[PDB]
Design a protein around this ligand. Structure first.
Ligand SMILES: NC(=O)C1=CN([C@@H]2O[C@H](COP(=O)(O)OP(=O)(O)OC[C@H]3O[C@@H](n4cnc5c(N)ncnc54)[C@H](OP(=O)(O)O)[C@@H]3O)[C@@H](O)[C@H]2O)C=CC1
Ligand SMILES: COc1cc(Cc2cnc(N)nc2N)cc(OC)c1OC
Length: 157
């Protein structure tokens, strides 16, 4: 299975200055629940924003830099190599990768953030006729989670 996983606001902003605009712990928890034991493919600026591979899953970074190397990261250099990865693979961002892959993935796990944060990167448009909703549920809000958010799981039609 090849899956997108992303969080975006109502404007479909995902990022600003190579960081996430918002801090939403419940999104990070959701990330962890879905991806533990599986494989992440992240494009290079995303990897550099996060700064280190995430524990307890395989971290693959996509880059055209031949000398790119990092401890605990496998490196690929074209989108064709994504097909070759085994098991459940998550396209983990950023925009360049989401743009490239949205017409290729089997399904998408989207966290829709009920907010408007200014951004310099976006998640591509996606429509009702391409995607069917497998589930939609609202995240629980609390002292640490103050922005309303929906977890949406879409599967290609
Ligand atoms: N809200 C969310 O869920 C998420 C948001 N983000 C946000 O997204 C933004 C980053 O997105 P963006 O700026 O588009 O950068 P990306 O994270 O998409 O990284 C782009 C880099 O990836 C490499 N790359 C992309 N396509 C290819 C290819 N076909 N072959 C080889 N290398 C490739 C290149 O690296 P090189 O230059 O090394 O060749 C390129 O410069 C950040 O603000 C981040 O915070 C990221 C993940 C999730
Ligand atoms: C676990 O930490 C991060 C995770 C991500 C990617 C990401 C985050 N949330 C969702 N729902 N999908 C994604 N692909 C992006 C990040 O920064 C750009 C992170 O650092 C804060």
């Amino acid at each position: 299975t090849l899956s997108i996983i992303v969080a975006h606001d109502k404007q479909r902003v995902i990022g600003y200055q190579n960081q996430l605009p918002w801090h939403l712990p419940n999104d990070l928890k959701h990330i962890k629940q879905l991806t533990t034991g599986n494989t992440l493919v992240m494009a290079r600026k995303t990897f550099e924003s996060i700064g280190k591979p995430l524990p307890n899953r395989r971290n693959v970074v996509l880059t055209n830099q031949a000398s790119f190397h990092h401890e605990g990261v496998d490196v690929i250099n074209s989108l064709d190599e994504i097909k070759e990865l085994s098991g459940h693979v998550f396209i983990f961002g950023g925009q360049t990768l989401y743009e490239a892959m949205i017409d290729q993935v089997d399904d998408m796990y989207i966290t829709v953030i009920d907010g408007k944060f200014q951004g310099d990167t976006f998640f591509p448009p996606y429509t009702f006729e391409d995607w069917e909703v497998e589930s939609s549920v609202e995240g629980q809000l609390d002292e640490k989670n103050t922005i309303p958010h929906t977890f949406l799981h879409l599967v290609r039609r």
